[PDB]
Tab-separated table of C-alpha atoms and ligand atoms in Angstrom:
chain	number	residue	atom	x	y	z
A	1	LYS	CA	49.308	109.157	103.462
A	2	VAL	CA	50.874	112.603	103.905
A	3	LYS	CA	49.130	115.975	103.661
A	4	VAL	CA	51.005	119.282	103.866
A	5	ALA	CA	49.394	122.683	104.393
A	6	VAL	CA	50.584	126.237	105.020
A	7	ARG	CA	48.800	128.745	107.215
A	8	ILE	CA	49.507	132.460	106.998
A	9	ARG	CA	48.862	134.376	110.215
A	10	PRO	CA	47.860	138.027	110.483
A	11	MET	CA	50.306	140.845	111.042
A	12	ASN	CA	50.933	141.119	114.775
A	13	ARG	CA	50.613	144.369	116.724
A	14	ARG	CA	54.233	145.409	116.222
A	15	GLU	CA	54.171	144.770	112.487
A	16	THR	CA	50.891	146.643	112.190
A	17	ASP	CA	52.127	149.597	114.242
A	18	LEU	CA	55.435	149.797	112.390
A	19	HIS	CA	53.984	149.376	108.867
A	20	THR	CA	55.983	146.247	108.059
A	21	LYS	CA	55.217	145.224	104.454
A	22	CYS	CA	53.430	142.036	103.476
A	23	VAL	CA	55.551	139.669	101.353
A	24	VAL	CA	53.291	136.645	101.289
A	25	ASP	CA	50.567	136.289	98.686
A	26	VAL	CA	48.338	133.278	98.050
A	27	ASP	CA	46.685	131.812	94.945
A	28	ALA	CA	44.367	128.904	95.662
A	29	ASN	CA	46.856	126.402	97.082
A	30	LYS	CA	50.040	128.152	95.946
A	31	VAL	CA	52.080	130.421	98.188
A	32	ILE	CA	54.034	133.272	96.641
A	33	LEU	CA	56.936	134.682	98.615
A	34	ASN	CA	57.771	138.128	97.239
A	35	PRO	CA	61.350	139.382	97.731
A	36	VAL	CA	61.996	141.762	100.653
A	37	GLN	CA	62.556	137.154	92.164
A	38	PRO	CA	59.217	135.848	93.523
A	39	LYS	CA	59.203	132.280	94.786
A	40	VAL	CA	56.228	129.986	94.331
A	41	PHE	CA	55.409	126.841	96.306
A	42	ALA	CA	52.470	124.476	95.953
A	43	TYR	CA	50.706	122.657	98.787
A	44	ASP	CA	47.726	120.409	99.523
A	45	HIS	CA	46.004	123.340	101.217
A	46	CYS	CA	46.864	126.955	101.882
A	47	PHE	CA	45.092	128.636	104.779
A	48	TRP	CA	45.159	132.410	104.345
A	49	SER	CA	44.252	133.738	107.776
A	50	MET	CA	45.380	137.366	107.592
A	51	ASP	CA	42.036	139.116	107.801
A	52	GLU	CA	38.579	137.882	108.851
A	53	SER	CA	36.778	140.469	106.705
A	54	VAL	CA	37.971	139.013	103.386
A	55	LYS	CA	35.373	136.230	103.327
A	56	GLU	CA	36.400	135.211	99.807
A	57	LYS	CA	39.566	133.598	101.205
A	58	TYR	CA	39.854	133.878	104.991
A	59	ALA	CA	40.435	130.577	106.778
A	60	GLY	CA	39.246	130.515	110.396
A	61	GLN	CA	39.749	127.810	113.011
A	62	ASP	CA	36.635	126.015	111.714
A	63	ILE	CA	38.094	125.844	108.204
A	64	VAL	CA	41.416	124.394	109.369
A	65	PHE	CA	39.609	121.626	111.253
A	66	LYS	CA	37.309	120.804	108.327
A	67	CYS	CA	40.233	120.362	105.935
A	68	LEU	CA	42.705	118.665	108.285
A	69	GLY	CA	40.927	117.571	111.460
A	70	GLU	CA	37.731	115.861	110.307
A	71	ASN	CA	39.557	113.337	108.106
A	72	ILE	CA	42.185	112.567	110.744
A	73	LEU	CA	39.430	112.036	113.328
A	74	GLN	CA	37.482	109.762	111.020
A	75	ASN	CA	40.706	107.803	110.525
A	76	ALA	CA	40.875	106.973	114.239
A	77	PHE	CA	37.265	105.762	114.244
A	78	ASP	CA	38.348	103.551	111.319
A	79	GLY	CA	40.896	101.964	113.669
A	80	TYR	CA	44.011	103.551	112.166
A	81	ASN	CA	46.773	105.879	113.398
A	82	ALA	CA	47.494	109.522	112.705
A	83	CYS	CA	49.690	112.488	113.542
A	84	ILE	CA	49.135	116.188	112.999
A	85	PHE	CA	52.183	118.456	113.247
A	86	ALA	CA	52.311	122.242	113.515
A	87	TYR	CA	55.682	123.388	112.224
A	88	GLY	CA	57.188	126.841	112.008
A	89	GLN	CA	58.826	129.901	113.479
A	90	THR	CA	58.143	130.980	117.047
A	91	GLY	CA	55.208	133.382	116.826
A	92	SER	CA	54.014	132.050	113.464
A	93	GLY	CA	50.889	130.320	114.797
A	94	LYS	CA	51.716	126.752	115.883
A	95	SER	CA	49.968	126.922	119.267
A	96	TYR	CA	47.130	129.066	117.980
A	97	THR	CA	46.479	126.368	115.351
A	98	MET	CA	46.901	123.272	117.521
A	99	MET	CA	45.242	124.396	120.737
A	100	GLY	CA	43.990	127.925	120.082
A	101	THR	CA	42.653	130.496	122.543
A	102	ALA	CA	39.586	130.443	124.789
A	103	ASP	CA	37.816	132.564	122.167
A	104	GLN	CA	39.371	130.819	119.129
A	105	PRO	CA	39.649	127.111	119.923
A	106	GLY	CA	41.998	125.212	117.612
A	107	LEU	CA	42.423	121.692	116.254
A	108	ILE	CA	42.698	119.821	119.519
A	109	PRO	CA	39.531	121.084	121.268
A	110	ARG	CA	37.484	120.699	118.071
A	111	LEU	CA	38.759	117.191	117.511
A	112	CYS	CA	37.988	116.144	121.097
A	113	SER	CA	34.528	117.718	120.900
A	114	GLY	CA	33.880	115.901	117.644
A	115	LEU	CA	35.190	112.665	119.136
A	116	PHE	CA	32.954	112.665	122.205
A	117	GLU	CA	29.943	113.769	120.161
A	118	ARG	CA	30.411	110.739	117.911
A	119	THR	CA	31.104	108.165	120.638
A	120	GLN	CA	28.113	109.333	122.684
A	121	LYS	CA	26.064	108.974	119.508
A	122	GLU	CA	27.160	105.427	118.650
A	123	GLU	CA	27.615	103.965	122.140
A	124	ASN	CA	25.043	101.562	123.603
A	125	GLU	CA	24.713	98.278	125.498
A	126	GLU	CA	26.399	96.357	122.662
A	127	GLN	CA	29.376	98.632	121.924
A	128	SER	CA	31.566	100.824	124.078
A	129	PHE	CA	34.328	103.365	123.603
A	130	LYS	CA	37.386	103.856	125.764
A	131	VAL	CA	39.181	107.178	125.411
A	132	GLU	CA	42.645	107.641	126.859
A	133	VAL	CA	44.860	110.699	126.736
A	134	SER	CA	48.528	111.397	127.370
A	135	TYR	CA	50.192	114.783	127.179
A	136	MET	CA	53.985	114.956	127.076
A	137	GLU	CA	56.762	117.388	126.277
A	138	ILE	CA	60.027	116.528	124.525
A	139	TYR	CA	62.830	118.947	125.401
A	140	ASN	CA	66.421	118.159	124.384
A	141	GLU	CA	65.513	114.516	123.736
A	142	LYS	CA	64.163	114.150	127.279
A	143	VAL	CA	60.469	113.474	127.993
A	144	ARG	CA	58.297	115.205	130.606
A	145	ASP	CA	54.757	114.203	131.639
A	146	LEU	CA	52.519	117.284	131.462
A	147	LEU	CA	49.710	115.488	133.319
A	148	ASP	CA	51.616	114.975	136.574
A	149	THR	CA	62.045	113.379	133.453
A	150	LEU	CA	60.840	110.036	132.107
A	151	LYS	CA	63.143	107.459	130.540
A	152	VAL	CA	62.736	106.292	126.943
A	153	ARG	CA	62.825	102.498	126.671
A	154	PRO	CA	59.072	102.414	122.144
A	155	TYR	CA	57.514	103.702	125.369
A	156	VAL	CA	57.906	106.424	127.979
A	157	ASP	CA	58.319	104.620	131.292
A	158	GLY	CA	55.778	106.084	133.714
A	159	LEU	CA	53.904	108.274	131.264
A	160	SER	CA	50.408	108.878	132.627
A	161	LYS	CA	47.643	107.628	130.363
A	162	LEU	CA	44.270	108.807	131.642
A	163	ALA	CA	40.797	107.506	130.861
A	164	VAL	CA	38.369	110.316	130.042
A	165	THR	CA	34.609	109.975	129.614
A	166	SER	CA	33.442	113.442	128.565
A	167	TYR	CA	34.658	116.524	126.718
A	168	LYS	CA	34.834	118.343	130.062
A	169	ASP	CA	37.133	115.581	131.350
A	170	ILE	CA	39.458	115.762	128.363
A	171	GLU	CA	39.310	119.537	128.742
A	172	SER	CA	40.651	119.464	132.308
A	173	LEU	CA	43.718	117.714	130.937
A	174	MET	CA	44.204	120.134	128.048
A	175	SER	CA	43.965	122.850	130.687
A	176	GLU	CA	46.184	121.090	133.223
A	177	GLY	CA	48.889	120.231	130.690
A	178	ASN	CA	49.019	123.681	129.122
A	179	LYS	CA	49.620	125.180	132.564
A	180	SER	CA	52.386	122.701	133.440
A	181	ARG	CA	53.938	123.673	130.100
A	182	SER	CA	57.628	125.783	125.494
A	183	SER	CA	58.865	127.375	122.280
A	184	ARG	CA	61.970	125.174	122.419
A	185	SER	CA	60.268	121.826	122.995
A	186	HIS	CA	57.732	119.613	121.232
A	187	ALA	CA	54.350	119.093	122.898
A	188	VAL	CA	52.519	115.839	122.071
A	189	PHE	CA	48.819	115.438	122.844
A	190	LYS	CA	47.967	111.761	122.390
A	191	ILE	CA	44.529	110.179	122.273
A	192	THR	CA	43.858	106.453	122.192
A	193	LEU	CA	40.348	105.554	121.065
A	194	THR	CA	39.253	101.987	121.638
A	195	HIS	CA	35.961	100.814	120.186
A	196	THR	CA	34.720	97.448	121.400
A	197	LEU	CA	31.779	95.478	120.031
A	198	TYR	CA	30.132	92.749	122.109
A	199	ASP	CA	28.481	89.458	121.217
A	200	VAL	CA	25.224	88.054	122.561
A	201	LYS	CA	26.865	86.807	125.782
A	202	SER	CA	28.609	90.135	126.417
A	203	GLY	CA	31.912	88.695	125.245
A	204	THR	CA	34.099	90.700	122.874
A	205	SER	CA	33.385	90.122	119.172
A	206	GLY	CA	35.059	93.175	117.634
A	207	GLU	CA	37.552	95.890	118.565
A	208	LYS	CA	39.245	98.771	116.750
A	209	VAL	CA	42.017	100.928	118.174
A	210	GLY	CA	42.883	104.351	116.767
A	211	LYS	CA	45.706	106.569	117.995
A	212	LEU	CA	45.896	110.314	117.464
A	213	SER	CA	49.078	112.295	118.111
A	214	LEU	CA	48.587	116.041	117.888
A	215	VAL	CA	51.913	117.801	117.916
A	216	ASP	CA	53.006	121.374	118.645
A	217	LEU	CA	56.632	121.385	117.465
A	218	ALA	CA	59.504	123.392	118.858
A	219	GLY	CA	60.154	126.651	116.990
A	220	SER	CA	62.174	126.253	113.817
A	221	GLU	CA	64.000	129.621	113.768
A	222	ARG	CA	67.802	129.815	113.685
A	223	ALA	CA	69.347	131.306	116.821
A	224	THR	CA	71.516	134.406	116.361
A	225	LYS	CA	74.780	134.878	118.222
A	226	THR	CA	75.328	137.976	120.376
A	227	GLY	CA	77.569	136.308	122.958
A	228	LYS	CA	73.017	124.547	121.569
A	229	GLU	CA	69.254	124.349	122.118
A	230	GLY	CA	68.711	125.438	118.520
A	231	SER	CA	71.146	122.790	117.282
A	232	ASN	CA	69.416	120.008	119.212
A	233	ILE	CA	66.063	121.234	117.904
A	234	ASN	CA	67.449	121.366	114.370
A	235	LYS	CA	68.470	117.703	114.455
A	236	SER	CA	65.033	116.659	115.686
A	237	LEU	CA	63.204	118.762	113.096
A	238	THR	CA	65.542	117.687	110.296
A	239	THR	CA	64.926	114.025	111.214
A	240	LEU	CA	61.157	114.528	111.341
A	241	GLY	CA	61.570	116.065	107.905
A	242	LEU	CA	63.345	112.998	106.521
A	243	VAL	CA	60.776	110.657	108.036
A	244	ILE	CA	57.759	112.505	106.648
A	245	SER	CA	59.364	112.943	103.203
A	246	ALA	CA	60.220	109.235	102.953
A	247	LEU	CA	56.720	108.203	104.009
A	248	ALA	CA	55.307	110.776	101.603
A	249	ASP	CA	57.391	109.163	98.856
A	250	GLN	CA	55.477	105.956	99.614
A	251	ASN	CA	61.497	99.426	100.432
A	252	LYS	CA	62.867	102.868	101.372
A	253	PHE	CA	64.705	103.463	104.642
A	254	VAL	CA	62.853	105.467	107.290
A	255	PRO	CA	65.069	106.844	110.118
A	256	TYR	CA	62.653	106.669	113.085
A	257	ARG	CA	65.397	105.982	115.636
A	258	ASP	CA	67.376	109.111	114.764
A	259	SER	CA	65.248	111.177	117.173
A	260	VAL	CA	63.096	110.674	120.282
A	261	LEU	CA	60.085	112.300	118.620
A	262	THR	CA	60.127	110.191	115.462
A	263	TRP	CA	60.794	106.987	117.406
A	264	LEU	CA	57.989	107.459	119.913
A	265	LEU	CA	55.585	108.155	117.040
A	266	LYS	CA	56.873	105.334	114.816
A	267	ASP	CA	53.592	103.433	115.321
A	268	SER	CA	51.558	106.373	114.002
A	269	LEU	CA	53.976	107.289	111.231
A	270	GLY	CA	54.478	103.908	109.564
A	271	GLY	CA	51.967	101.332	108.333
A	272	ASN	CA	48.584	102.642	107.206
A	273	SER	CA	48.875	105.837	109.241
A	274	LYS	CA	47.913	109.313	108.063
A	275	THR	CA	50.080	112.358	108.678
A	276	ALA	CA	49.012	115.981	108.327
A	277	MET	CA	51.443	118.862	108.658
A	278	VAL	CA	50.544	122.542	108.858
A	279	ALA	CA	53.485	124.856	108.267
A	280	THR	CA	52.696	128.187	109.949
A	281	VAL	CA	54.258	131.390	108.584
A	282	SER	CA	54.319	135.145	109.114
A	283	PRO	CA	53.208	137.360	106.210
A	284	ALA	CA	55.738	140.040	107.142
A	285	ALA	CA	58.939	141.306	105.495
A	286	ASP	CA	60.920	141.095	108.760
A	287	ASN	CA	60.453	137.313	108.807
A	288	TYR	CA	61.351	136.593	105.170
A	289	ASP	CA	64.274	134.292	105.937
A	290	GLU	CA	62.405	132.132	108.406
A	291	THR	CA	59.293	132.167	106.242
A	292	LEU	CA	61.375	131.072	103.249
A	293	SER	CA	62.962	128.314	105.342
A	294	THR	CA	59.580	127.112	106.598
A	295	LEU	CA	58.210	127.004	103.054
A	296	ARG	CA	61.151	124.911	101.798
A	297	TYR	CA	60.770	122.546	104.743
A	298	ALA	CA	57.080	122.126	103.948
A	299	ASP	CA	57.795	121.732	100.245
A	300	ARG	CA	60.422	119.071	100.950
A	301	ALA	CA	58.068	117.073	103.168
A	302	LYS	CA	55.445	117.085	100.402
B	401	ADP	N1	45.832	132.686	112.368
B	401	ADP	C1	45.855	133.507	113.450
B	401	ADP	N2	44.862	134.391	113.689
B	401	ADP	C2	44.872	135.205	114.761
B	401	ADP	N3	45.857	135.212	115.677
B	401	ADP	C3	46.921	134.377	115.553
B	401	ADP	C4	46.978	133.456	114.407
B	401	ADP	N4	48.120	132.753	114.525
B	401	ADP	C5	48.738	133.173	115.657
B	401	ADP	N5	48.023	134.147	116.266
B	401	ADP	C6	48.406	134.851	117.521
B	401	ADP	O1	49.764	135.301	117.402
B	401	ADP	C7	50.518	134.948	118.562
B	401	ADP	C8	51.559	133.896	118.203
B	401	ADP	O2	50.850	132.666	118.026
B	401	ADP	P1	51.410	131.274	118.593
B	401	ADP	O3	50.609	130.142	118.008
B	401	ADP	O4	51.562	131.411	120.083
B	401	ADP	O5	52.889	131.185	117.969
B	401	ADP	P2	53.838	129.893	118.069
B	401	ADP	O6	53.081	128.821	118.801
B	401	ADP	O7	54.091	129.544	116.618
B	401	ADP	O8	55.075	130.356	118.809
B	401	ADP	C9	49.537	134.354	119.558
B	401	ADP	O9	49.096	135.377	120.461
B	401	ADP	C10	48.367	133.909	118.710
B	401	ADP	O10	47.149	134.020	119.443
B	402	MG	MG1	53.812	128.161	120.870
C-alpha cells in the first residue's frame, strides 16, 4: 500500500564551512530531531546519507533503489500501478534522489535501466513489451509538457507520450526534459509498461499494463516576507498529504479532485496501487523548522 521513508542529506558546503551543528540523529528506522526536548519519529525506512565513509549506516543511491525502487518496478511488471514521491525542503535532496547526478544516478535512471534489462531478457517472438514515457511539470495547477500550457480535462490534452525501445532512448528524454525544466513546481516522470503475450496464431492471448509515476515535488518550505506561489504549493502538498494518509489508512473519502496532481494520478493512487514517499531532510541546525515540518508531514502520511 503506502511506504514512507526519510533520507538525510550531507551538510552542504556552506554548513560545513560555517560549522553549523548537526541536529538529526538516526537509530535504525527512527529519526531523532534534537532541539536547536528531542523529538522521535518512526518510518518504514530511514536513509542516513551524511557520510560515505561510515559504511555501518551510509545509504547510497544503490541502497535507496533496492529498498524503494526494486519493489515498485516489480509491481509494474505485475501489471499494477505505482507512484514514488520525493517530498521536502528546497535543497534537501529531492532531485538528487529522484534523478541524481551524472556521477550519482538516482531512482529514475536505475529504474529505467532495470526495466529495459528485464524486458530485453523476457522478450521473444511470443511476448513483447511496449514502453511509453511522458514527462510533465505542474506549476500553479497548470501542466507543461517537458518533452516538447496543456488543459486538464483525467487526462492532459496534448501531452506527448513517447515509445522508447532502449535505455539510451529513455535517457534522451530524461535529458531533454530536465533541460526544458523547478523548485516551485512538481515534475512527473511517467512510464507505461505494456506486456503482451501472443497465442499460436499471433493473436493476443494475454496483456498486463503497469504505470509508474516518479514524482519530484515542489519545495515544501514556507516563504518569508521581506516585502502566493508558496500558498498554491501548500494547498497541493496538503491535499497530496490527505490522499496518501487516507490510502495508507486502508469506505473512506479520498479527495483526488482537490488538486491537479492528485487527480491526474488518481489511477495510480487508488485501487491496488503502491505508493512510496521519501521525505528528504537537512541534518543542519539552520533548517530545524523545515526539517521538523517535513518529519511531521511524513509521519502523518504514514
Ligand atoms: N544524499 C545526498 N548526497 C550527496 N549530495 C546530495 C544529497 N542530497 C542532495 N545532494 C546535493 O545537494 C544539492 C541539493 O540537492 P537537490 O536534490 O537539488 O535539492 P532539492 O531537489 O530538494 O531542491 C544538490 O547539489 C545535490 O546534488
Ligand atoms: Mg530540485
